[PDB]
Symmetry: C2
Subunit: 306 residues, 2 copies
């Protein structure tokens, strides 16, 4: 047993990261079949990012203005298009290491693994969540742009995120692999407000179950509560409203532990109103919201991939 | 910027995990060149683990009693030996995907990535530390035995850990790749006391620097302290004694932030004696000790591998 923030194994995605250079700027791209995907601001210098006209800037460029590297191999570019905020560089050779894959647009609260990359080479892997305000709290130095986030379903990689920028407030924003930003953000160096963020209530509940499964039980109380009365305490503390769909997703976990969902809510209430007392749950002194109910079950049952 | 618990990219190690079966028991093995490495208790049934005579049990076995699987490929076994607590199964075909590699025995306080595996298939990856009492706080369900831990230096994988058992107290123990246990543990299902654990002081200091680098600065105080007086407060709170070697390793971080090491110690003192006040550092309400000084620099400068 034991419980850890685990990322997916990253082999299938390492064989897809390439380096993309256009004039001065270099970042990471994703080579699937015979298309390379990367952030379109690869075509801006530092001054352009103040106020870029992306169509005009791309017109100054031709197929040979794009240097695409995969290890020491160089790919030839023979076609280039702009889909929303992503560049699609049509290359001549299809990636021998292309996995089976989907492009997926995820929902807030969902989690994914990130392969942080620099110069087209993988540096590390970690799990993070799409916040309710469509930002991610990641780890992205200069040149990490074009790093991707992904889930794996046995054989199939579901690419859901490409990193584009660090906001002035230090959090991170990016697109799906169709180039549409998550959230109200744009690829422009300007002041951009992320909204008010809140805590992913259904994730916190999934993590309290994982705690019960692993022996940590001091927070279990005799009280109970109702859905509407729990929601009144949720909004006092900046937690998402719990819906019946959320109660249903927590169904299996409810069945394995024998603790009904609204009983777990009443435990959460008293943690919210009284704190943790200087105690810990699963090694943490805060309420953790970066595990989905599906994550908890995968880790607690031993689901593999390959 | 931002700071995350990052694991190494796990591609190089996925291509090495195989499934090993001997009679009833199945676990994971590590196929490097033409040798498969796995925990020797693969040759015990459930009752044997109470009190196994490993030499006698291995004598009942011959080369064809060992089923080694890599995906759907089967390997032929043509030699088998017991080195301390590991089995070495000599197979006929050399692993085409063998990376450059070393076997390394690490020190307490050092960190490594773990690839949790079931039935020879990777399930997830995470970073953990060798506690001062030679245990690890991991995530290991039944059949995870033989999962390995590793570091990567650019091209080279340094294998340092193989998982063998969960102690009755819920923590985990294992060997280096020469089969010698870290700590006083044995591969026997019995009551085994891990010693008193303590907090890895030099790691906590490295994480406070990472905090300063990333904007989190509320814990910086005007006071200072001495090495011996700080050590007196360390042992009050179950922290490792800080040595000059530890001060030296924190040297570069001292130089990049401009805060001398003993000034950072005086900040830590006041956190230990007064707590965190209900505040956070880098998202955590506790003092984190699972980053080494080398980890902090790798993440804050962007070191890659491939």
């Amino acid at each position: 047993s034991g419980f850890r923030k685990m990322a997916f194994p990253s082999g299938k995605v390492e064989g897809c990261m390439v380096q993309v250079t256009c004039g001065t700027t270099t970042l990471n791209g994703l080579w699937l079949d015979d298309v390379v995907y990367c952030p379109r601001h690869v075509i801006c210098t530092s001054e352009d990012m103040l106020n870029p006209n992306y169509e005009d800037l791309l017109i100054r460029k031709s197929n040979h203005n794009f240097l695409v590297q995969a290890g020491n191999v160089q790919l030839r570019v023979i076609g280039h298009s702009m889909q929303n905020c992503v560049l699609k560089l049509r290359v001549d050779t299809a990636n021998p290491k292309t996995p089976k894959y989907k492009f997926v647009r995820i929902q807030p609260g969902q989690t994914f693994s990130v392969l942080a990359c620099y110069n087209g080479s993988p540096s590390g892997v970690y799990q993070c969540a799409m916040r309710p305000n469509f930002t991610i709290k990641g780890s992205f130095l200069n040149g990490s742009c074009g790093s991707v986030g992904f889930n794996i379903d046995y054989d199939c990689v579901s690419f859901c995120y490409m990193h584009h920028m660090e906001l002035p407030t230090g959090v991170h924003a990016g697109t799906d692999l169709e180039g549409n930003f998550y959230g109200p953000f744009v690829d422009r160096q300007t002041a951009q407000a992320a909204g008010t963020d809140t805590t992913i209530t259904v994730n916190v509940l999934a993590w309290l179950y994982a705690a019960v499964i692993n022996g940590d039980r001091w927070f279990l109380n005799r009280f109970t509560t109702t859905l509407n009365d729990f929601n009144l305490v949720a909004m006092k503390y900046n937690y998402e409203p719990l819906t019946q769909d959320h109660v249903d997703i927590l169904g299996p976990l409810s069945a394995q532990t024998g603790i009904a969902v609204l009983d777990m809510c009443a435990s959460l209430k008293e943690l919210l109103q009284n704190g943790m007392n200087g105690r810990t749950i699963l090694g943490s002194a805060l309420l953790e919201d970066e595990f989905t109910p599906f994550d908890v079950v995968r880790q607690c049952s031993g689901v593999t991939f390959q």
